Amino acid sequence: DMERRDVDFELIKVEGKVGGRLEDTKLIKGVIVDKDFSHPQMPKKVEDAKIAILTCPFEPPKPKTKHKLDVTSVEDYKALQKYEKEKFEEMIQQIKETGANLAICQWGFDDEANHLLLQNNLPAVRWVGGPEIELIAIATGGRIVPRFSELTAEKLGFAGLVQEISFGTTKDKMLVIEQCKNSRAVTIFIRGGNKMI
Amino acid sequence: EQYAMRAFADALEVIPMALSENSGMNPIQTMTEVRARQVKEMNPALGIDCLHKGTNDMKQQHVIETLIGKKQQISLATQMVRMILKIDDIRKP
Amino acid sequence: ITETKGTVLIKTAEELMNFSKGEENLMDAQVKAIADTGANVVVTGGKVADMALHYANKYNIMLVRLNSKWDLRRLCKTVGATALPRLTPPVLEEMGHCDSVYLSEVGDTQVVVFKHEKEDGAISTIVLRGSTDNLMDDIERAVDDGVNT
Amino acid sequence: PLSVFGDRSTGETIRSQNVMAAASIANIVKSSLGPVGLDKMLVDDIGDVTITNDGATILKLLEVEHPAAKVLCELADLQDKEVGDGTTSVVIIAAELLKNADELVKQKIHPTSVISGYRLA
Amino acid sequence: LAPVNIFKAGADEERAETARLTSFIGAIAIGDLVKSTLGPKGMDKILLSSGRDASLMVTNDGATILKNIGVDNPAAKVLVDMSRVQDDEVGDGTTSVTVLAAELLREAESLIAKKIHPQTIIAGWREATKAAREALLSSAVDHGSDEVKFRQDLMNIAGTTLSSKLLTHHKDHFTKLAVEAVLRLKGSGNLEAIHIIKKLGGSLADSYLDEGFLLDKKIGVNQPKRIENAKILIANTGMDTDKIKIFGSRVRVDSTAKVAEIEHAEKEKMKEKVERILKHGINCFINRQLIYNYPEQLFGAAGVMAIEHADFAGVERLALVTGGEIASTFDHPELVKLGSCKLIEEVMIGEDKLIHFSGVALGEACTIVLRGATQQILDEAERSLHDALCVLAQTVKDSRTVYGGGCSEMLMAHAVTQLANRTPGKEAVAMESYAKALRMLPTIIADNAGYDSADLVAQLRAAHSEGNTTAGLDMREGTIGDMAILGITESFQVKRQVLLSAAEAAEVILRVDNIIKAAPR
Amino acid sequence: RKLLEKCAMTALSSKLISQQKAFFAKMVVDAVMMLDDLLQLKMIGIKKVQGGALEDSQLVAGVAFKKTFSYAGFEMQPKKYHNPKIALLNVELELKAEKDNAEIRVHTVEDYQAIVDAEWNILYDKLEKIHHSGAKVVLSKLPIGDVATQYFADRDMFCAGRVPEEDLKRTMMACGGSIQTSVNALSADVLGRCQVFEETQIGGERYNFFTGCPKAKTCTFILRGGAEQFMEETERSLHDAIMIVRRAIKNDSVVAGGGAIEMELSKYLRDYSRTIPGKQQLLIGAYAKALEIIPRQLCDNAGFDATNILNKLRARHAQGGTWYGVDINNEDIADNFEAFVWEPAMVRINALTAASEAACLIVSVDETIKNPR
Amino acid sequence: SLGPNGLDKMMVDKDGDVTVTNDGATILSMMDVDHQIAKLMVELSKSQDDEIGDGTTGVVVLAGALLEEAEQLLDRGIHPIRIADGYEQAARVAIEHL
Amino acid sequence: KGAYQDRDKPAQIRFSNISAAKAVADAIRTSLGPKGMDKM
Numbered sequence A: 001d002m003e004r005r006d007v008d009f010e011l012i013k014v015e016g017k018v019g020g021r022l023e024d025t026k027l028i029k030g031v032i033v034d035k036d037f038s039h040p041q042m043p044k045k046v047e048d049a050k051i052a053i054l055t056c057p058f059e060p061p062k063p064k065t066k067h068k069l070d071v072t073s074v075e076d077y078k079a080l081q082k083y084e085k086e087k088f089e090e091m092i093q094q095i096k097e098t099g100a101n102l103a104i105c106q107w108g109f110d111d112e113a114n115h116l117l118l119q120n121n122l123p124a125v126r127w128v129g130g131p132e133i134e135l136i137a138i139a140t141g142g143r144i145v146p147r148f149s150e151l152t153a154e155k156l157g158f159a160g161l162v163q164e165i166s167f168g169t170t171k172d173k174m175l176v177i178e179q180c181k182n183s184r185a186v187t188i189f190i191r192g193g194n195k196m197i
Numbered sequence B: 001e002q003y004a005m006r007a008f009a010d011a012l013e014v015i016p017m018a019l020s021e022n023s024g025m026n027p028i029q030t031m032t033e034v035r036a037r038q039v040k041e042m043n044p045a046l047g048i049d050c051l052h053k054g055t056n057d058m059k060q061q062h063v064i065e066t067l068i069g070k071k072q073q074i075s076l077a078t079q080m081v082r083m084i085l086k087i088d089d090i091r092k093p
Numbered sequence C: 001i002t003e004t005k006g007t008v009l010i011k012t013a014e015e016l017m018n019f020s021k022g023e024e025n026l027m028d029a030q031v032k033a034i035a036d037t038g039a040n041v042v043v044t045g046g047k048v049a050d051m052a053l054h055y056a057n058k059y060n061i062m063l064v065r066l067n068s069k070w071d072l073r074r075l076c077k078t079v080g081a082t083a084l085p086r087l088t089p090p091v092l093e094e095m096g097h098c099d100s101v102y103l104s105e106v107g108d109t110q111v112v113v114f115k116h117e118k119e120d121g122a123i124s125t126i127v128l129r130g131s132t133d134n135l136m137d138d139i140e141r142a143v144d145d146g147v148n149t
Numbered sequence D: 001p002l003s004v005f006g007d008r009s010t011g012e013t014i015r016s017q018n019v020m021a022a023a024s025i026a027n028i029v030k031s032s033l034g035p036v037g038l039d040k041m042l043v044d045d046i047g048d049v050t051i052t053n054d055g056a057t058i059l060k061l062l063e064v065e066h067p068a069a070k071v072l073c074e075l076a077d078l079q080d081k082e083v084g085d086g087t088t089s090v091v092i093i094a095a096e097l098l099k100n101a102d103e104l105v106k107q108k109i110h111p112t113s114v115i116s117g118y119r120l121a
Numbered sequence E: 001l002a003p004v005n006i007f008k009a010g011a012d013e014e015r016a017e018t019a020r021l022t023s024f025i026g027a028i029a030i031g032d033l034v035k036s037t038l039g040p041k042g043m044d045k046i047l048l049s050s051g052r053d054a055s056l057m058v059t060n061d062g063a064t065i066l067k068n069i070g071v072d073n074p075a076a077k078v079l080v081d082m083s084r085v086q087d088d089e090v091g092d093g094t095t096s097v098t099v100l101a102a103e104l105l106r107e108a109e110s111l112i113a114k115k116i117h118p119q120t121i122i123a124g125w126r127e128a129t130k131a132a133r134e135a136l137l138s139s140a141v142d143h144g145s146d147e148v149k150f151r152q153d154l155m156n157i158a159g160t161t162l163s164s165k166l167l168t169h170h171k172d173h174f175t176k177l178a179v180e181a182v183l184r185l186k187g188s189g190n191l192e193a194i195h196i197i198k199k200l201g202g203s204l205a206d207s208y209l210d211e212g213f214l215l216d217k218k219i220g221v222n223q224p225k226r227i228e229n230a231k232i233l234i235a236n237t238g239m240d241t242d243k244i245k246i247f248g249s250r251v252r253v254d255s256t257a258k259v260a261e262i263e264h265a266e267k268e269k270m271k272e273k274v275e276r277i278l279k280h281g282i283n284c285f286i287n288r289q290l291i292y293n294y295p296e297q298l299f300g301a302a303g304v305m306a307i308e309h310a311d312f313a314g315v316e317r318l319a320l321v322t323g324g325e326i327a328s329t330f331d332h333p334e335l336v337k338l339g340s341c342k343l344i345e346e347v348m349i350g351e352d353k354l355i356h357f358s359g360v361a362l363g364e365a366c367t368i369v370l371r372g373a374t375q376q377i378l379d380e381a382e383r384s385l386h387d388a389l390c391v392l393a394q395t396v397k398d399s400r401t402v403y404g405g406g407c408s409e410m411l412m413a414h415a416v417t418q419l420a421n422r423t424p425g426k427e428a429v430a431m432e433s434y435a436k437a438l439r440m441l442p443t444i445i446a447d448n449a450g451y452d453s454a455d456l457v458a459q460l461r462a463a464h465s466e467g468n469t470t471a472g473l474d475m476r477e478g479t480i481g482d483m484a485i486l487g488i489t490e491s492f493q494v495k496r497q498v499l500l501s502a503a504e505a506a507e508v509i510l511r512v513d514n515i516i517k518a519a520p521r
Numbered sequence F: 001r002k003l004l005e006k007c008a009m010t011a012l013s014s015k016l017i018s019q020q021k022a023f024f025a026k027m028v029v030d031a032v033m034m035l036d037d038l039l040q041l042k043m044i045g046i047k048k049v050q051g052g053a054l055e056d057s058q059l060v061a062g063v064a065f066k067k068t069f070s071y072a073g074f075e076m077q078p079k080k081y082h083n084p085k086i087a088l089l090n091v092e093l094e095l096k097a098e099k100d101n102a103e104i105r106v107h108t109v110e111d112y113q114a115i116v117d118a119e120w121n122i123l124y125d126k127l128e129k130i131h132h133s134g135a136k137v138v139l140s141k142l143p144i145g146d147v148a149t150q151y152f153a154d155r156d157m158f159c160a161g162r163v164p165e166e167d168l169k170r171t172m173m174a175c176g177g178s179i180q181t182s183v184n185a186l187s188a189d190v191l192g193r194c195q196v197f198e199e200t201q202i203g204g205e206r207y208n209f210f211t212g213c214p215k216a217k218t219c220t221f222i223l224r225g226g227a228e229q230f231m232e233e234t235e236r237s238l239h240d241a242i243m244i245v246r247r248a249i250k251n252d253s254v255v256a257g258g259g260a261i262e263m264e265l266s267k268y269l270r271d272y273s274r275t276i277p278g279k280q281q282l283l284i285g286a287y288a289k290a291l292e293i294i295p296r297q298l299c300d301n302a303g304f305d306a307t308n309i310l311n312k313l314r315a316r317h318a319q320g321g322t323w324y325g326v327d328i329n330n331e332d333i334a335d336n337f338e339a340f341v342w343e344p345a346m347v348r349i350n351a352l353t354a355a356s357e358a359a360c361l362i363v364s365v366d367e368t369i370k371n372p373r
Numbered sequence G: 001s002l003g004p005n006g007l008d009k010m011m012v013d014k015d016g017d018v019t020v021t022n023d024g025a026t027i028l029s030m031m032d033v034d035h036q037i038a039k040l041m042v043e044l045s046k047s048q049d050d051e052i053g054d055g056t057t058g059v060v061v062l063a064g065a066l067l068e069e070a071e072q073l074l075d076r077g078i079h080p081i082r083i084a085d086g087y088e089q090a091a092r093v094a095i096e097h098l
Numbered sequence H: 001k002g003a004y005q006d007r008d009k010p011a012q013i014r015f016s017n018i019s020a021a022k023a024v025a026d027a028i029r030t031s032l033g034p035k036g037m038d039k040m
């Protein structure tokens, strides 16, 4: 940032993990996270995908006010049961119609939504409510939408290589994104054999 | 006021002495040699050879530091010394 | 509001969209009707609101808040006005005519002085100046003894 | 630093303490000096009334743990043994002289000059 | 010490002599506590406790003992953390690296006692480690194309790994079992697919490896037991009270007939969902949640096996064994797919009944049934099997083996000695100390075995200096033999990581001064 | 201005910032001169940022406050504007319910979805009404949600919530706006205006600047130096200098500092004591002799001969030679009126009256009665 | 802990954590002192690390050396105000010359 | 290139002795000279 003669330490993510060697420290021009995929059968590595940053969860809409739904007949219950799956299919098609290949939410998912995402071939990352969303939006350059109806083709981030990495015999998996454009945030991966190192 | 300036000049040379002590050589002898070499020639880039490389010139040894950092350090040390020299009372339980 | 515990019931979106609009419109209308009588300063005796304060500052209306259950009655007896338990515009016979209402400070203490240019009036206030609380208390006791005498 | 195993003062605190002790000793027997003064009373633990006002006996039967008080008591005892009259006036004069010299000491004046002036006077 | 108090009450600080002395004493104690279990003929220890639930475990691994002891020395804590990191990395060499670190620290103690600057020792140790890591890469055997030799190398590595624990009596079968279980992963590094089921009954001779899959769950009531040529379909839905709607739906009626109609509609919806589940043409339903009474009888009335209580691990294992996917919704039967199984029955192992799954198609996952007489023996066998599987996966992913037994340490010591014999200065003492610490490991091994250690070490060093750069130490008799004839083979990445961790720990502990301890809470 | 600077340098002579008394004088002069007419001491903001020396302290001509808690859409908006428009609001910009005492009794899913869409419609209408005012900087006391932060970042606009009341009042007094509660009346006369707005890193903390306001009546001080005690002493010295300048402006009457006024008063009281006989002469003489404790204590703090200096001052006052005080650097006596040493005359009168009242109250005490507990 | 030949330090937390570093400010922040002057030095080192970041113990070493040098002048018979003024003048001269 | 020291207790002992001697000399410095006072 030469036009203002200042930097920002919040953009540089400094993360470390035990195991490995000290000479394995390298620079990554992307955003790394400590989460995995929502489904184990989802494809791990991808070559051409688009980032779809989302904030609303994969649940039906619910207002924060005090609302009461009254069902006094079988017709109302049947209409509600039909509208549930109707809205589910509508939002699933809206996620696919935007052209993106990898959506990013914030909160948890469900069962039917995860099954539909696996059937439609679209990986996703869960639990990223921290600065990871901001880092991805800054690096990839994609915009953030609050709902699903505003997910357009212009508000998508370009991804180069999104593939998780495996360590030793532990059950810890970390997803790292690389091959991005002119990003303004990099990550520093520190590896060692001791905790104080 | 010449006694305070001499004390400040004598206390400012505590870094080369500490470096020579941590290295493993004579502190006062190396400091006097560096001072003589600096007052005899015209190059303010003669430090203490801590890595034992031979030449004492810091221009070719790739020893680069900071200027604003050293200035702020000196100013903060002087301010703290002035503040400590002003306090002369204590009332602790 | 109502004394009995009661909530609002809304169903359609028109009510949810127009409730706050109608509330703000009624508040603005009440503020305009209160200031239409010619009042320059409103002295309340309870909790104030943000929208009411903003509407009063928009029409240049001074707001004075105080709670003591005695100072309000003293000010009403001094300025010759009556208290209203509702937010209704007062009548000409229920107005408090003063002389100069400003906000100054003496001895690093903000105080509101209600000085009147009339020689008579109702009650007065003696201001004491000193450097010790005991001396001020003694002066107050001497003033009380003189008043009793 | 300086392990003395005890208590110590500074410079002016000891002088102020000595001045206060001398003033208290003087005020103890300051109501039986002139001919219009009354007598005192000294009672012990077993109950023995001692009505006297000579000054020397009161100072001897006082038991004070102060150095200046003991010095004044022994001076009054020496005065009573050598003469017998004027045992309290000398102590009062000494206390007044100490109080007057304390003000000069507090005014950044060396005690040697004050002592020389007192001796000359 | 200065007479003016600076620190708070209850805080000690060691300078240079006392701090280094305490650190060296703690390091020597840590190295000597585990030194008894290093050689192949080592014994076991007892790790009893009193604050928990009277847990009693008997193991031979050093990292487990160091983690269960709970030390308090700062250097001992760093050593325990390093051992834990090494165990989480590859999990094969913790006692060796901690003994090497203890020997290096003991040598550094005598070096400092000889008036030597720590910087020179650090530089010499770094140069020795660099020379060792440079000479170790040149002595590596590459394999991958020849599967016949690769299988023999894997078998030898598994045998050498299993002969260092309690499985020396049944190494002739456990090695083959681990080899057969490793090849079933098809190169996948997922170690969670191998399920270990320990039972109390038979001995180690009754242990085997199932070619299919086993499950310790129960089936529903009024359901067929054995089903031939079935189709397993893994699902993920909530049959127990299907109320996934997060809406505020509440029944606000005014008659019991409306409530009865709502209940009948809910029952009809549940029946329709059950029928849509069976619309795929399956006969073996598997869910991840609980099954009530209505879906149980609905599945039993049609002759469909229902399995309850299945977590994520079991679902993943079943999907890897069969081939089906975790389906839901149930709307498109074409994009769901099924599994393949032609033999399903229930077996009785000891006193419990388990479901047996045979006739699989793929078979990416497998289960191993372990039998033992004592819980400690079963835990030791499970730990040894896990370590063997981990080292086998590591040596498979590495695709290169290195002759073990002590040849690599001797080669590294010879390289360090040759490097030190060419440079002067005070750096020759650090390299000599490193070579002595490296050569002390075969000495400790021979001392724990029960033979002459000094003579064997001298003979091995003379052979390595004269040309025999491939010999080792015979443990069956106590002589000198070639490592390529017997069948002792270790790894390369494991030894490299061990050496790097030892060097890092030595360099970190070497520059330690002023141990400032705060006030304990 | 010269008299104000001299008074500030005299008041800041026996303080901790005595080495930099000529630098803070102009600062406090410019701060008091731009304090409207009623002299509002609460309008001057005193900020303390860790780091920097005494020479790094600057005085801005606007307002400045610490960066509040941000969200996820804070690094996506530009932090520099040329001529923006500040809009001080006071409503919450987040997704929440309307009223706490409300209840929605929906029937079917149609009205449910209608209300769900109408909530976001109202939110977007409010966000557009705030954006339609032509503003660029949004400041409000209530915390701002993430939805409004993400909406404002897409249009290259700056926003900041959780603004304190004092900071908002200072910003309003500096710019010239007003506190707007509702967003249904956002005109052009209720919006702020500045010349520059940046956000740099000073001492590892993010701070905002709003300098460039010709109609401003307040300022903000950035005090640097030590950590806690040094900053507190600097703030106390700044407050004392501000009070001294305010008194010099309100009274415009200062006299010569030092021990000249006390010596003149003692001489006058000693000369007046030679007229009234009786026991009144001794009391006036003691009162005059007690007034000479200021020069003695002033000369005894540096280890000087106080007796000779007091005698010389008494001789100079009796032989005349009116504003002759003491000297520390010259180790003698000089004219304090020509040495630029001026002090407010009302301070001495107030101190004398307070001392007289305290002495009278202490003498009036006869019997002291104490009660347990 | 000054220079390339200096060693590292080891600190013990309140619970039982082990921390080994040589930054200087972190060592002083977890020292747990109770002599005010030590807390002042710790705060000064923390402020220096927050401002610049490099050289956290050099400033306190220079301050200690200056105080040790001024102790001799104070024991000789010089007023502390004159010593502080001379030190400030020398610091200003050094800053202007650097 | 050598002369390494691994002992610190004698240095601290000498420093403490020097400090104690300096404190004693400063305490006895009052009773010195013709213009000195007496102690109790």
Ligand SMILES: Nc1ncnc2c1ncn2[C@@H]1O[C@H](COP(=O)(O)OP(=O)(O)O)[C@@H](O)[C@H]1O
Pocket (backbone or CB within 6 Å): E037, E038, E039, E040, E061, E062, E092, E093, E094, E095, E096, E097, E160, E161, E163, E164, E404, E405, E406, E445, E473, E475, E488
């Ligand atoms: N059958 C064997 N023949 C020769 N050497 C062996 C044999 N088994 C183990 N060793 C040696 O014992 C050492 C320790 O092996 P092991 O116990 O598996 O590791 P750790 O001691 O870290 O638990 C190894 O370095 C290896 O060289």
Ligand SMILES: Nc1ncnc2c1ncn2[C@@H]1O[C@H](COP(=O)(O)OP(=O)(O)O)[C@@H](O)[C@H]1O
Pocket (backbone or CB within 6 Å): F010, F011, F013, F014, F257, F258, F259, F298, F325, F336, F341
């Ligand atoms: N530069 C100066 N020249 C002469 N006298 C001074 C100077 N600075 C301070 N003084 C004197 O020192 C006295 C103490 O002033 P100050 O420390 O500012 O407040 P306070 O009176 O509360 O201690 C004042 O009465 C003033 O006359």
Ligand SMILES: Nc1ncnc2c1ncn2[C@@H]1O[C@H](COP(=O)(O)OP(=O)(O)O)[C@@H](O)[C@H]1O
Pocket (backbone or CB within 6 Å): B047, B048, B050, B063, B065, G001, G002, G003, G004, G006, G023, G024, G054, G055, G056, G057, G058
């Ligand atoms: N290679 C070098 N050559 C010359 N001087 C050095 C070198 N490395 C460090 N120093 C000196 O050692 C001092 C201490 O530096 P260091 O220990 O790295 O950080 P800190 O200043 O925080 O202690 C510095 O003031 C620097 O001048």
Ligand SMILES: [Mg+2]
Pocket (backbone or CB within 6 Å): D085, D086
């Ligand atoms: Mg007589």
Ligand SMILES: [Mg+2]
Pocket (backbone or CB within 6 Å): E092, E093, E164
């Ligand atoms: Mg092993």
Ligand SMILES: [Mg+2]
Pocket (backbone or CB within 6 Å): G054, G055, G056
């Ligand atoms: Mg540094």
